[PDB]
Amino acid sequence: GPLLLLVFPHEALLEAGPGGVVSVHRPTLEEYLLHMKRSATPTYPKDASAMVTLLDLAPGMRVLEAGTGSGGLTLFLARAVGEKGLVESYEARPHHLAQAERNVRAFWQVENVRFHLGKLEEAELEEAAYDGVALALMEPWKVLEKAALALKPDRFLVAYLPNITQVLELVRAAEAHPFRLERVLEVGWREWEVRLPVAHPRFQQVGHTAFLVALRRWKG
Template sequence: MRFGEWVLLKDVKGRAYLLRLREGGVFGHHRGNVPHEEILRAGFGGRVRTHLGEALSVHRPSLEEYVLHMRRAATPTYPKDAAAMVMLLDLFPGARVLEAGTGSGGLTLFLSRAVGREGRVVSYEKRPHHLRQAQENVRAFSDLDNVDFLLGGLEEAQLPEEAFDGVALDLMEPWTVLEKAVRALKTDRFLVAYLPNITQVLELLERAQAHPLALEKVLEVQHRTWDLRPPVAHPSFQQVGHTAFLVQMRKWKDSSSTPS
């Protein structure tokens, strides 16, 4: 551990706090303060106490924890959905993936990790302040340097044909970029869209009929956490409900192709 690294502190009630260690820094908790130097000495997996005696455990933040607590210009793709999108895209080390709707960079981080150092993520975002925040978030957490951040919409992008192993769309109206996205996607590979409501899903599927795309599945990712305090065990009272529908489509050779 060293100054400049991200640290996740957890208190006795499981509340998490993300911070970046800096020389002379002090973490403020409602139950007291603790200097960053003490956190550094404790190291990952260690414990510190505030000046009022509150115990805090020290952890290296996971990707999930970082995305949930990082600064945001837009609501990030929930980690449960981002992980599912990586699966639906069938990504692998060395893959090239096209993303439209960078947002705060949450999904971008998952895509970057999935394709690895030899792969590439090309990410488009129309809103300059969102793109700046995403760049900061991704570069602050990852040293892979495998993401190209581009300001603009996919509608105007000049993309090579059949150059990408996957396309991830986090847009309110993804059908407006289907022509560009499908041309850039390799045959028999996947396009996955993240959509908050079912009317968007229906609109996308209707518009997709004009393109060489076949619907594979539409799903929601549900996580049900449990509160375990032996001998008592019950589902947690606070649960993350619906976040989005994930739509997976596969590219066929031409618009007349249909599954056999």
């Protein structure tokens, strides 16, 4: 495993071990995302958590992922389905895919993630074979056809979109597919500074990273 202080093994650090001093730590997935090599957005832990919760991902399921880097969203999905549920992650741009496979593979040593280079709409997949579809695309409405195709009825597709304008365009686009609009939310984590006697919500905030969109696949 990798260590946070971010390094990949020098030996005082291992002898101290996590929670020990030389301040050595074993990274949380969160810490790891926030310090890993990025070309990405990056997908934030608060958003990826809520996405796994809307997708209703449980162990053993199949989850379809697109697109971009860098394995941030893919790892959260990877733990959610784990064991051998399956993550089929699609990325279009090849050095971003590369970087992501590296990112994921160094933290997560299980092999429940199948990686695919190429747009999701080019790909061929079974009808009604997937337990959820997670998208982190700037133009998600493109894959809507495939997504309704590959997605078991009464399951969700969950898009991640920064701009509300993109969210509206999905919601209209989604009206021409067997998808019923289930949720539109903004996730927010309100950090507090506690350095007693100082105790206030932090002065500078992550005032949202993105909107999460959730469509449910009704039968059609």
